[PDB]
Structure formats: structure tokens, C-alpha cells
Design a protein around this ligand. Sequence first.
Ligand SMILES: O=c1ccn([C@@H]2O[C@H](COP(=O)(O)OP(=O)(O)O[C@H]3O[C@H](CO)[C@@H](O)[C@H](O)[C@H]3O)[C@@H](O)[C@H]2O)c(=O)[nH]1
Ligand SMILES: O=c1ccn([C@@H]2O[C@H](COP(=O)(O)OP(=O)(O)O[C@H]3O[C@H](CO)[C@@H](O)[C@H](O)[C@H]3O)[C@@H](O)[C@H]2O)c(=O)[nH]1
Ligand SMILES: [Mg+2]
Lengths: 271, 269
Amino acid sequence: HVVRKAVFPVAGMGTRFLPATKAMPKEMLPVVDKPLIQYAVEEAVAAGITDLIFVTGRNKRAIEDHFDAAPELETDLEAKGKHELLALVRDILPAHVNCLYIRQSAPLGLGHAVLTAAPAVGNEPFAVLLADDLIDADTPVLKQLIDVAVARQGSVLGVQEVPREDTRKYGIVASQPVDARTERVTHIVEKPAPEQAPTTLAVVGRYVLEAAIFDHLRATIQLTDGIAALLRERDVYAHRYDGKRYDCGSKAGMFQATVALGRKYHGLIPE
Amino acid sequence: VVRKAVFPVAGMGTRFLPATKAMPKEMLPVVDKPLIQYAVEEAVAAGITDLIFVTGRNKRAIEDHFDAAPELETDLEAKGKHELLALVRDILPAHVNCLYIRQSAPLGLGHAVLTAAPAVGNEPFAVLLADDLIDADTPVLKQLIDVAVARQGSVLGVQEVPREDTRKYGIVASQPVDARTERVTHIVEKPAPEQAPTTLAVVGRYVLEAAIFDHLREIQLTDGIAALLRERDVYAHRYDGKRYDCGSKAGMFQATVALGRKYHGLIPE
Ligand SMILES: O=c1ccn([C@@H]2O[C@H](COP(=O)(O)OP(=O)(O)O[C@H]3O[C@H](CO)[C@@H](O)[C@H](O)[C@H]3O)[C@@H](O)[C@H]2O)c(=O)[nH]1
Ligand SMILES: O=c1ccn([C@@H]2O[C@H](COP(=O)(O)OP(=O)(O)O[C@H]3O[C@H](CO)[C@@H](O)[C@H](O)[C@H]3O)[C@@H](O)[C@H]2O)c(=O)[nH]1
Ligand SMILES: [Mg+2]
């Protein structure tokens, strides 16, 4: 089991952040001075990912230009002696990491975006990271999940408990415990009503998936329904990662991430 | 009489890298809206119909924001999301137009303004710097335009600043003509505190007569305004409104907090 490829779906419409997402993916919005997608990419690279796969939509321009070289910007900075800032631009990706881009044909859903990556993944297990789940963790959450996936020989979903009123926001798993932090998944259901949700254990935007998922995404698109079918055929585990998740998919969550991370890592204090 | 506005949108925002690697500084959002869109909405609210964007790196970030995107409108309308479709169409109101001109190189605000001359022609025009995010009950540009038409001259938006801050601003020497407006007799660019003639600073709002263009053919805007002073009337106006200096991370944060509260109900936990 070797997980070296990561898929970043960044092709959604971003309607909760209009007008800012008119011509920019939601994942390119900054938290202070860094786009959401760069936090997630940095986490993946720290977890041993070498092959980055960006699934883009009509707003691909900003994602491409963020991770590709900007020789004109580097020329300027280099000329003005700003070697400090030069690294912020050219060293976003270390040299042992590569990226590629695949355009999702239409915004047909997260499951369809993951399936769109199949030509670059092949028959390899792979990571999926949803950058609007911004996670502050002392050990990269993706690394935590990859270690479980290697040890237990299966797919792994990052999960954490949520208030029962919040189940309508998330995929919710039914499972049976395996150790303190890990459970074997017996069902997953997307955004159930709180009165119907089988548990309050919710999927965060971090996945390690066996390539078997792709055939199920063809016969499904919602990613959660592909996973629920994968269950019937292979092992899927849910892991309670250590870390603080900010749900930046809403204006409110992004705001509280700016406040909390602004304070902790930048000393930004509300007046 | 003022219906054209120039928006320099070439900011490198080096203090905001890597966020500004792929978009100009003026595209960064405060809550859910790019800085440039606050400034454009202020201009449109003041009767501006012709938007003139002076671009630099990542020019299509600005263009794709303001240009219609039929693909997006087609998808929203098909999903019955009619409030969101109207929001997207209001980014550029139907009576408003915009055009794009490239700055040849980063030669300062004065060069950027001069770059807009072919689009402005001989009429008076506004300049708005999107990093100065101003929240006011009456649009600040409207306040300045009203003064310009009344007094038949150019108008600089000003506010008092700490003397220790004058190296950040253009500073005006001037004589009161009414409670909020002064007649400018001199302007100096970013003086040392110990040599600043006053503490009355120009913020990023201008209403300028087209005569400025010949005086800029002087690379700094303050030097152009000082030459314009020898031939035409220039006033400074203490606008009413709260300015957020979004040129620093600290200032942009205070704008997110304050406007988050006022316009979106968002309260720090
Ligand atoms: O056509 C599309 C639609 C979405 N996206 C991307 O998909 C992600 C978000 O998809 P969306 O379906 O809006 O996600 P959520 O509603 O937050 O729910 C997902 O993410 C949650 C974790 O945040 C999980 O609990 C849910 O099970 C899972 O479906 C983002 O990366 C988007 O860029 C695409 O690339 N293409
Ligand atoms: O080569 C350049 C430099 C700047 N800009 C744009 O011009 C504005 C800011 O220019 P800069 O000269 O860096 O502004 P400040 O240092 O804030 O000073 C200007 O703005 C102040 C108000 O904030 C005034 O007091 C000053 O007189 C005036 O020079 C932004 O819209 C930039 O995108 C360009 O397009 N090209
Ligand atoms: Mg989300």
C-alpha cells in the first residue's frame, strides 16, 4: 500500500461565496494571506504525496496560475533583491512534487469530479482533499489517514463527531469500533435529516480511497453513494483524526477561521 | 458631469503573497466581495457609467470578474437559483460598461492615471484606489463629485492622520472654504513627519479635471496635481465615512471584522 497521488476537486460553482467566486474557485479564497487550496496541498505534500491532481472547472485560471511558475513575478522579485518573497512564490511546491490539471466537463458533482481523475490515478490508491475543510493539526490529517489505510489495508475516511443538528451538512457513517480512533464503516449516507441520521460521526473532506471506487462512481453522481457501494465489496474505515477543522464552505465558517487562525498564527485581534 | 472612473488594479500586494500570486491585490475579498467590487459599487452609486480598469499581472482575473459569464448564468438559471443569478448580473449593472487598458510597467499611480487618458478624453473623471475601502452612508465618490460640480474644480478626498504616518500619504496645504472643503495650494508626496506641512492626507479618492493629463506627460500623481495647481482650482474635501486601509494584513482584517458584523451578522466567536 503506497499512497502518492492526491486529487483536489476545485471545479465547483462556489455559490455560497458569490460574488467573490464569480471567476475564482472557492478554494482560491485566502485565509489571511494563503489560499485554502495551498493549505491542503501543503498538508498532502507533508503526508508523502508527490503527484498532485487538480480537477478544474470554468474557473481553472486562478488554480493553474497559483501552482504553476510565474517567471515574470520571479524576475521582478529577484531583481529587487526580495529573495525572502521569491521563495513564497517559487517554492510553493518542492522540487520532488509535480502537478497536473484535468478539466471536469461540467459541474456534475463531487463524485463525478473524483471519477474525472481516474485517467491520472490508474489502479493506485489515492487521496482526495476538499480544501474548504481547513484543518489545523500538529500531524497532517492526511498522514494520519494514510497510516491507517496502510495498516488496515483499506479505504479510510476522516471523521469527527458533530452536533446532531449539523448532520444535514455532511456525510454520516454507521460503523463498528476497531480501535480507539478507528471504526469499520457499515454505511454512509449524505446529508441526512438530523431525525434520521444513524449517528453523529461525520465525514471531513479528507479521504484515502482504493481505486476500486471508480467502477462504483460509474454505476452511481455523489461521492458518498460511490463509497456506500464500495462498502459492500471492500473494507472502508473511518478514522477520528486529531486536529481542529474549520468548515470554510460557508461565509460564517470562513469568517471564524480568519478570526481564529488570524489570532493564533498572525496576532490579528478584533478591535 | 463626472461619469467615468479609473481603477488602478495592478497591485502586486507583496504583503499578501502567496494569495496574490495569481490575482491582483484588488481582487482579494473582504468577506464575500473583492476589494475592487466595493469601489466599483461606490462609483456606480455615484452615477459613474464608464469603468476604466488599468491592469497589470493576472489581468484576466479582473476581466473575468466583471465580464458576463454566460456559462455561469445558464447553469444558475437552470437550477432555479434566481436570487444568485441576479446577484451575478449585478456585478456589472446593465447601464454600466467597462474597458481594460494595460499599464506598460509599474511606474506609479501617476503613470496609471495617464494610461487612462485615451479612454477619458477631455472630461472630468474619478480615480478610486480599491485598497482604501470606505464604508459611508452616502458614497464618498458622490460626496466628492458634488463638490467638484459645485466649485468647478478637481477634488481630493482627505482625512486627518497622525503626524507619524505622513510618510504613507500625499499631504495637502490648504485654506478652509467651508466646514468640510478646503482650497488646496500645495501638495507633497509622503513627507517625513518632521517636514509635513499639515496632517491632512489624501486617501484613494479623486475627482480630476482632464487638464491633469498634460501635467502628467511628471510620473507621480502628486507632482501632476501640484502642476495642475498652477493653472486650475483643486479642493480637498473631508468626506464622511469610515476608511479601512486594506494595504496591510492588519487593516484588511479589521475590515473583515467590521463589515462582517455590519452587513453579514458575523461576530467573532
Ligand atoms: O461539480 C463539482 C462539484 C463540486 N466540486 C468540488 O467538490 C467539493 C465540494 O463538494 P460539495 O458536494 O459541495 O461538498 P459538501 O456539501 O461540503 O459535502 C462533501 O464534503 C463534506 C466534508 O466537508 C462531506 O461530509 C460530504 O460527505 C461530502 O459530500 C469542492 O472541492 C468543490 O470544488 C467539483 O470539483 N465539481
Ligand atoms: O506602479 C504602480 C503603482 C500602483 N498602482 C496602483 O495604484 C494604487 C496604489 O498606488 P501607490 O502609489 O502604491 O499608493 P499609496 O502608497 O497608498 O499612495 C497613494 O495613495 C494614497 C492614499 O491611500 C495617497 O495619499 C498618495 O498620495 C498616493 O500616492 C493601487 O490601486 C495599485 O494597484 C499601479 O497601478 N501601478
Ligand atoms: Mg464544503
